[PDB]
Design a protein around this ligand. Structure first.
Ligand SMILES: Cc1ccc(NC(C)(C)C(=O)O)cc1
Ligand SMILES: Cc1ccc(NC(C)(C)C(=O)O)cc1
Ligand code: NA
Length: 330
């Protein structure tokens, strides 16, 4: 089997991407944030505290002929932005892009935090990290990808995120038309449950490439690129008037600037992030201070190759017995 679904940015900044997902019978279509940095498939639901729902489409298990309570199971999750949700669990049929899984754990939110409530465009998350991170208790559940594996033509999914444009998530195949050149594969550690890999270095603009090992995770659910403070300082030093602002929460730069590109290494290959991708616009409406898309990972405890980095590439998440990541330019 295969599946193929379009993913669409939620706003003009590419703050996140949503992908339609069919849940239940008859189908209930919800727009989920596919997150390679977590392992729960959770949704706004008919169970979600009413004051915490503001415009999201909800899953109603009582209207699905294939829904069944997973008796006794609960879940509770916290994300890197400090957001959270929790609830109970159903099993149901879930389809993405024509690929169907029966018996998928669909985590129904009873409570979501204010960041979720305030974002009417995201109806839930679909986790694509390793199932060892799934929060369901007392019986941990598998991700959609882990349940679909048995069945896929190739045990892979790919992320092809757009810059200010739609992109694609494919399951079970490589679309050799979607990238240029060759795909460079690199080793993955699953020890922390993430798609964790080691970049071979970086360059700033037209500068020389610095060979240096940078461990981090490939995380479609994180907007920005978070790297060590040394690397980030070297990048923003090339932008006149850029500075780290404790009041704003990271590096800011004059909106009048033209940003340099940022290159990261994948083995002997190089992925170039255009300068424009690193612009996250005014810090507040009408400000001439703009927020940077490359930020320090210091205090976060891990480096994160979020959407800023990933949307510069065609990315293969290879879930074979020995998982690997692949990157190609596009
Ligand atoms: C609506 C919304 C969108 C995204 C986030 N961030 C997540 C994905 C939870 C994270 O992993 O930091 C929180 C709320
Ligand atoms: C273990 C380790 C790994 C990498 C580096 N280099 C850094 C600090 C990322 C750089 O800025 O070049 C240093 C130590
Ligand atoms: Na922000």
């Amino acid at each position: 089997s295969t599946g193929s679904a379009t993913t669409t940015p939620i706003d003009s900044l590419d703050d996140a991407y949503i992908t339609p997902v069919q849940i239940g019978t008859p189908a209930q279509t919800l727009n989920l944030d596919f997150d390679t940095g977590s392992s729960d498939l959770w949704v706004f639901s008919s169970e979600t505290t009413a004051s915490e729902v503001d415009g999201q489409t909800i899953y109603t298990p009582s209207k699905s002929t294939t829904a069944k309570l997973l008796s006794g199971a609960t879940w509770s999750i916290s994300y890197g932005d400090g957001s959270s949700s929790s609830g109970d669990v159903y099993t149901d049929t879930v389809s993405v892009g024509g690929l169907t899984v029966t018996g998928q754990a669909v985590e129904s939110a009873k409570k979501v935090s204010s960041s979720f409530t305030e974002d009417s465009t995201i109806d839930g998350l679909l986790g694509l990290a390793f199932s060892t991170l799934n929060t369901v208790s007392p019986t941990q559940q598998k991700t959609f990808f882990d349940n679909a594996k048995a069945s896929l033509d190739s045990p892979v999914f790919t992320a092809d995120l757009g810059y200010h444009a739609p992109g694609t998530y494919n399951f079970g195949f490589i679309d050799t038309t979607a990238y240029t050149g060759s795909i460079t594969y690199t080793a993955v550690s699953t020890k922390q449950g993430f798609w964790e890999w080691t970049s071979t270095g970086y360059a700033v603009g037209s500068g020389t490439f610095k060979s240096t090992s940078i461990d981090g995770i490939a995380d479609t659910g994180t907007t920005l690129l978070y790297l060590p403070a040394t690397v980030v300082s070297a990048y923003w030093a090339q932008v006149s008037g850029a500075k780290s602002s404790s009041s704003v929460g990271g590096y800011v730069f004059p909106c009048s600037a033209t940003l340099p590109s940022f290159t990261f290494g994948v083995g002997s290959a190089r992925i170039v992030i255009p300068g424009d991708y690193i612009d996250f616009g005014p810090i507040s409406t009408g400000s001439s201070s703009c927020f940077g898309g490359i930020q320090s990972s210091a205090g976060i405890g891990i480096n994160i190759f979020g959407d800023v980095a990933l949307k510069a590439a065609f990315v293969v998440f290879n879930g074979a017995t020995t998982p690997t990541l692949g990157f190609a330019s596009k």
